[model samples]
Target: KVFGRCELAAAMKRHGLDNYRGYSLGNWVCAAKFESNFNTQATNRNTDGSTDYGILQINSRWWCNDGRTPGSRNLCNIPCSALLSSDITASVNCAKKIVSDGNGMNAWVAWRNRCKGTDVQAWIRGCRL
Candidate 1:
């Protein structure tokens, strides 16, 4: 699949996370699994019958229509739906940027901690990406 685990890992590596652990990747993969089962083209409908899209579950109405213009700060001008069309690495890097806001890797570290453990390297087994 285009959005398989290997593809995701490669995309993450392209964004300079070459040494990413499987646990972290797995956690992300699990989120995707739970959200969309790695479906790059996934789309969902809300209780009010609205739609959301992509593996990251970005809401078009929130991230694309209204919340896009000012908050993007020109750093990511594209609509959230379009984010999936860009290079996956760029998307991941943008997510890191938004989460980190140019801070240290604290956001990523926190993500690792919450998803797996403090020692992100140890949470995963048979890491091969």
Candidate 2:
């Protein structure tokens, strides 16, 4: 559940994502650290009886369609942990895509916007990564 620095760095490298190490990663780590402290096994209950789990706090009931047990299936397919174990780049890419699609990065952008003092909505307008 505890992601070492190497594991996190390696995971980011595998996804072809850079600039995260000291910048984006630091920001992400700060957010995740505050949210769940990089615990890949963390889980929280919603009032609707669903769950939010893992680093990115993916909502299982909302994102996952597979019937596999929570920790059994790839986190990408199972929600929560999927954000951690599955194609992590895909999730990042998905966020990029959503931001590119004009949703303005939703929570992710808002977090960074708050941290960086930039326009959250405009920054994601033409985002490619």
Candidate 3:
């Protein structure tokens, strides 16, 4: 699903991502815009042979298991494919785990570069979250 901005905001907040580790809904919504553009099926291969999956672009190298990424820890304990669905439940849960693992929202390069240290609230301005 290519979610609308408000829709994505509502969904993320519903799943407890609104203030997960001090990263607000705006931060997550901003990262989603850059990382996957809200596309559920988004995937990008990394330079080190790992792949990122789904809307938040969780990585196979450290999060989800793709059965191919070298030295994968599967810390999310889910198949990478699980993140590709429109449900977004798995993706959000894995993202929380990522944040709790001490990576913060900076686990995503897109978040660090674009969503950090800015007026991220603009990303959710139109949403009634």
Candidate 4:
């Protein structure tokens, strides 16, 4: 499912993403905006053969196990396919793990390149936080 901006915010908030790891919902919404455009089923294959899966685009290389990445640690202990569900709970949990591991929001390149140091609030305007 493709989540509307505010809907995604509310959903993530319910899953405890609002201010996880010192990052705001705006930062998360902005990350999702550019990462997968709020598409739960989104998937992208890296040139190196690893795949990024789900809304937050958790990667198979280190986060989730796809049984394909040569060195995947599967740190999230979840099948990469689990991230594609619109339920979003697993994605949110995995994203928190990424941040808790000291990766920060910068673990997502899209967040670093586009959402970082920007007016992230723009991503959550008109939303009831």
Task: Locate the minimum summed-lDDT window of 10 residues in model 1.
Answer: 65-74
The TM-score values for the models, in the order shown, are 0.53, 0.51, 0.97, 0.96
Among these predictions, the greatest TM-score belongs to 3
RMSD from true fold, candidate 2: 8.2
Off by over 4 Å in 1: 16-23, 48-50, 66-76, 97-127
Two-way lDDT contest, 2 vs 3, winner: 3
Model 3 residue 6 distance off true place after TM-score fit, in angstroms = 0.4
**Candidate 1 total steric clashes:** 0
lDDT by residue (1-129, candidate 4, tens digit) is 999999999998899988788898899999999999999999999998999999999999889999889966898999999999989999998999998877688799999999999999899899887
Candidate order by decreasing lDDT: 3, 4, 1, 2
lDDT of 2 by residue, 1-129 (tens): 576544654564455444432334444544444445566666676666656555655555545433533443242443344555534554554334333434342444325545455432332233333
Question: What is the alpha-carbon lDDT of model 2 when measured against the actual structure?
Answer: 0.47
Instruction: Decide which is better by TM-score, 3 or 4.
Output: 3
Query: Candidate 4 versus the native: TM-score?
Result: 0.96
Question: TM-score ranking from best to worst?
Answer: 3, 4, 1, 2
TM-score of 2: 0.51
RMSD of each: 5.9, 8.2, 0.8, 0.9
Q: lDDT (CA) for every model shown?
A: 0.48, 0.47, 0.93, 0.93
Alpha-carbon error at 11 in model 1, in Å? Answer: 1.5
Off by over 4 Å in 4: none
Candidate 3 has an lDDT of: 0.93
